[PDB]
Amino acid sequence: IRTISKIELSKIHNRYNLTVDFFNDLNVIHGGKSTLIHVIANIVNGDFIRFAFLIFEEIKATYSDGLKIVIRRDKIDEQSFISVTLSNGKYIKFAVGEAMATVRMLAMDIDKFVKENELQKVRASYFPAFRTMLEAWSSSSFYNRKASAFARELFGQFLPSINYPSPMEIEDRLREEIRRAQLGIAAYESRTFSESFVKVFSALFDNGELLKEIEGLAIAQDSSIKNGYYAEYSKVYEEIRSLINRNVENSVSGALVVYRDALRDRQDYQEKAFSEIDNYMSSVNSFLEDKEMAYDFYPKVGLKFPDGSWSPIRVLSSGERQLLTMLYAASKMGDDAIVLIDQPEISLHIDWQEDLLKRMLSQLSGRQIIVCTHSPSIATGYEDFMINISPEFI
């Protein structure tokens, strides 16, 4: 996909410069740090209208696929203007005073420009440093502008939009994925039934160990949470065993083998369909100890304790909720993006900080991750990927 490669600031706040070269994979930033992340976030999102609130000269923005974004803010006739220039050369220019009035046609122009040049192909998920209090304030896609406006009023009109997925959205997306996976299993069920019929139909004309294998597969299917709609496999296997014992042709062996293949392929397709959900749930569960997240077959999705009582996701504290959202954002079930985190070391025990980056990389999404940290526990074991930001003060 498209990942950021290099950011070249010039005279931000008219006092200091900076020039950073990135890696496509994980990026640990240690050392105006939050300001740098905001600049990166506002470029990748394509929300260029915020850069008429920052004093600078020139900001190059080089991607990995060769794309280039050169923003430039100049003051002519005591009037400020922003001159965004891309790789192909389509320079755009609007007046600053237009932007400030709109906040309290211009926005329509920006989206048409960005869409035409294929610039918003990759989104960016922003995790602010004040998310802990922010979710409490939203206790009560509809919380994407209101909460953003609230945060911008509190911390400044340069703050990028708040896109990070709330736990309610995570639960609903898990539910929809479960529905789609179930439908895929049903389609596979139909195809296997047709295929099994024709198979035996032909080799019928052609003229204990397999029983044990089918018994193992049947009890595995009955011991599978995903089979919450049908668990009669042990019963029908014993009926087949009763049928065999009362009375061996070659076709009978073929019937045995086709049953084993049908069970195994149904099981394997189940694993493939639920691969993403199970990998995400296992990665989360490698941290949690008190309970474990799971599902029940409008199939419920929630936490499950060893006592057997379920609970909604909102019972979780702030520390667990941050872990939930970030690990979701680096999973394949999310949206193709660049994970922009301000401070992950909030309400986290030291053990989870030792392995946070490990789990996020081991999910193997391929998405670019850029973290700015001050703790050495977040960054330990990843010395080769650390980038030190030392801005040159002029």
Ligand X SMILES: Nc1ncnc2c1ncn2[C@@H]1O[C@H](COP(=O)(O)OP(=O)(O)OP(=O)(O)O)[C@@H](O)[C@H]1O
Hey, which residues between 161 and 190 contact its own copies (CB under 8 A)?
A: 176, 179-180, 182-183, 185-187, 189-190
CB 322, CB 339: distance < 8 Å: no
385 binds, among ligand X, its own copies, none (CB under 5 to 8 A by kind): none
Contact between 192 and its own copies by CB under 8 A: the answer reads: yes
- Name the minimum Å distance from CB 20 to its own copies: 18
- Name the minimum Å distance from CB 229 to its own copies: 4
CB 20, CB 7: distance < 8 Å: yes
275-285 and 250-273 helices, crossing angle to 10°: 60
Contact between 219 and its own copies by CB under 8 A: the answer reads: no
Contact between 224 and its own copies by CB under 8 A: the answer reads: no
Nearest to 100 by CA among 39, 160, 158, 34: 158
- Name the minimum Å distance from CB 47 to ligand X: 19
Task: Tell me how many degrees the CA angle 6-336-156 measures, rounded to the nearest 5.
Answer: 65
193 binds, among ligand X, its own copies, none (CB under 5 to 8 A by kind): its own copies
Q: Residue 151 corresponds to which tokens in the numbers above?
A: 């945060």
285 binds, among ligand X, its own copies, none (CB under 5 to 8 A by kind): none
DSSP structural state of residue 178: H
Beta strands in the chain (DSSP E): 4-12, 16-21, 27-30, 58-63, 68-76, 79-86, 92-95, 123-127, 292-296, 300-304, 310-311, 337-341, 368-372, 386-388, 392-393
The smaller minimum CB distance to ligand X, of residues 323 and 339, is found at: 323
Binding residue for its own copies, selected from 66, 76, 205, 384, defined by CB under 8 A:
205
219 binds, among ligand X, its own copies, none (CB under 5 to 8 A by kind): none
Binding residue for its own copies, selected from 114, 262, 277, 379, defined by CB under 8 A:
262
Residues 293-322 close enough to bind its own copies by CB under 8 A:
298, 305-307, 309, 316-320
User: Where does this chain touch its own copies (CB under 8 A) — which range of 45-53, 82-90, 127-135, 379-387?
Assistant: 127-135
User: Where does this chain touch its own copies (CB under 8 A) — which range of 47-55, 114-122, 275-283, 373-381?
Assistant: 373-381
User: Where does this chain touch its own copies (CB under 8 A) — which range of 19-27, 84-92, 278-286, 372-380?
Assistant: 372-380
Site residues (CB under 6 A) for ligand X? 13, 32-35, 311, 315-319, 347
- Name the minimum Å distance from CB 118 to its own copies: 19
Nearest to 155 by CA among 136, 132, 130: 130
CB 258, CB 200: distance < 8 Å: yes
Amino acid at 185: I
The smaller minimum CB distance to ligand X, of residues 55 and 186, is found at: 55
165 binds, among its own copies, ligand X, none (CB under 5 to 8 A by kind): none
Binding residue for its own copies, selected from 66, 78, 89, 136, defined by CB under 8 A:
136
351-359 LR contacts (CB < 8 Å, sep 24+)? 352/287, 352/323, 353/377, 353/378, 354/380, 354/381, 355/286, 355/287, 356/323, 356/326, 357/26, 357/28, 357/381, 357/382, 359/283, 359/286, 359/287, 359/327
Contact between 63 and its own copies by CB under 8 A: the answer reads: no
